[PDB]
Every structure is written in C-alpha cells, then in structure tokens.
Design a protein around this ligand. Structure first.
Ligand SMILES: O=C1Cc2cc(Nc3nc(Cl)ncc3F)ccc2N1
Ligand SMILES: O=C1Cc2cc(Nc3nc(Cl)ncc3F)ccc2N1
Ligand SMILES: [Cl-]
Ligand SMILES: [Cl-]
Lengths: 124, 4, 124, 4
C-alpha cells in the first residue's frame, strides 16, 4: 500500500497498556503463581506468550478469570517476565537468570529464552 | 512519520 | 535500572494484537459508525484514542459492549484509523484526508491530527 | 537486544 507509518506508535501503545495495568484498568485475569497473584490483560499475555495464546484460544479456558501456573514456577521470574511483556525491558541478573529462563521456556517466550541462553553461555 |  | 531491551517487542505485540482482531479473538466491543460495525479490543482503543480512554474509564460506559459514534463520523475514516491503531500505518489519501482528520480530532488521536494538518498545508 |  501507500501508507505512512508513525515510528513510535507501537511503543506508545505498549506504554499506555502498561499504564492501564498499573492503574488496574480493564484487567480481566489473575495469574496465580503459588502464593502470589498478578493481574493482567488476556490480550497482552496472548500477544507475548505461546502458552497464554494457547490457553485463551481454548473454548473453555478463554472464559476463566483465574489461571494457576505450575507450582514449579518462580513468582519473581514470572513478575520479571510480566514486566517485560508490558515494557520490552527485561531485568536479567545473575541471581534470577535461571528462574527467568525456566519461566520463559514454560510461557513459550522464545526471544527471552534466546537472550538467557546467550548470557549463560558467556559466563561458562 | 516515515515511508515504511 | 540495569534492564536489557528487545527492540522489536512493541511492534511484535501490536502485530499479534492485530492478528487477534483479524481472527475475532477476545474482541469485547462493537463500535457503530452509522450503518457499519467494527469489532475491537477496548484496551487497544483506549491506548490509541483520548475519546476511548475517557469512555472506557467511565464507571458506567466501561461495561458497554456497543458504542455508537456521532452520526457525523465517516465509517471509512473510522476504518482507516482503526487499522492505524492496530498497525502504526495510516492510509492517508487526497480523497480521504478530510474525513480522516475530522475523525482523528473526534477520537482525540493527536499524532494523526498533526500529520493530516501538515499534508493539507503542503497542498495549499 | 540492546542497552536501552
Ligand atoms: O515465543 C512466542 C511468543 C508468542 C506469542 C504468540 N501470540 C500470538 N501469535 C499469533 Cl500467530 N497470533 C496472535 C498471538 F497473540 C504465539 C506464540 C508465541 N511464541
Ligand atoms: O492523542 C491521544 C492518544 C491518547 C491515548 C490515551 N490513552 C491512555 N492514556 C494514558 Cl495517560 N494512560 C493510558 C491510556 F490508555 C489518552 C489520551 C490520548 N490522546
Ligand atoms: Cl519473547
Ligand atoms: Cl495518534
């Protein structure tokens, strides 16, 4: 086509979706990771994660307001990944990289799994 | 704005 | 912070949100523009438009599944703007610029209003 | 991935 494109549009949209999350506006699911609870928007979760895409395209699970993750999942790892979904920024540290990579494999977030593998390889 |  | 950032994340999220729209997955509102109907995600509309942000933060309107726009709004202009919300690309043409600018003013989409004003000024 |  002959469209023009606003370079910052996608980043500005994501910033506004994170502001809605902050302010608990139109959040429609609670993700439970053992004793912790995280409120989010199903569409953002599906857009970032192959696991959430599969969950919320299921004709029964699409209607659930609570999703319980596998008890082996680390709440801090999940929190770091949820923040990445809404901001593009990943708080990857020596002390959390193993939990973050394991969580990203479970959530099916291939680009995160990729940077974790590279950071681990560099320290070996 | 740009030509994509 | 000491975060790393994935450059393409925001664009990839927006591409996936447009794929959900295409496939009518988790759309939660119908926008009526006279005889036409457009299905969308409230959160994407709020993230792009000051008018939708105000509508869906209202304690009563947040719960509506149908929103009727002012009868003066042009359906093609709305369609072009809805596509822009989900893709960052604006199909601005000599034949639609007046309707697109009027619709963007109504929807409170300041960057679109800005490029329309500039394109109009250049032809004068 | 970059340093933002
Ligand atoms: O590593 C990843 C990230 C990821 C996100 C999605 N999300 C969607 N995919 C499609 Cl094709 N349309 C709409 C979506 F919301 C699916 C798989 C995967 N795998
Ligand atoms: O031209 C524009 C585009 C636009 C979008 C929004 N959207 C939101 N704003 C904030 Cl501060 N937090 C969350 C949002 F979804 C508000 C006003 C305007 N005006
Ligand atoms: Cl990813
Ligand atoms: Cl805009």
């Amino acid at each position: 086509d002959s469209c023009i494109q606003f370079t910052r549009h996608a980043s500005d949209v994501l910033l506004n979706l994170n502001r809605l999350r902050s302010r608990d506006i139109l959040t429609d699911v609670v993700i439970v990771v053992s004793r912790e609870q995280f409120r989010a928007h199903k569409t953002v979760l599906m857009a970032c994660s192959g696991l959430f895409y599969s969950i919320f395209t299921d004709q029964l699970k699409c209607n659930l307001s609570v999703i319980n993750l596998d008890p082996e999942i680390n709440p801090e790892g999940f929190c770091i990944l949820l923040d990445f979904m809404y901001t593009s920024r990943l708080n990857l540290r020596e002390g959390n990289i193993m939990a973050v990579m394991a969580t990203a494999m479970y959530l099916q977030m291939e680009h995160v799994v990729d940077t974790c593998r590279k950071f681990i390889k560099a320290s070996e | 704005w740009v030509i994509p």
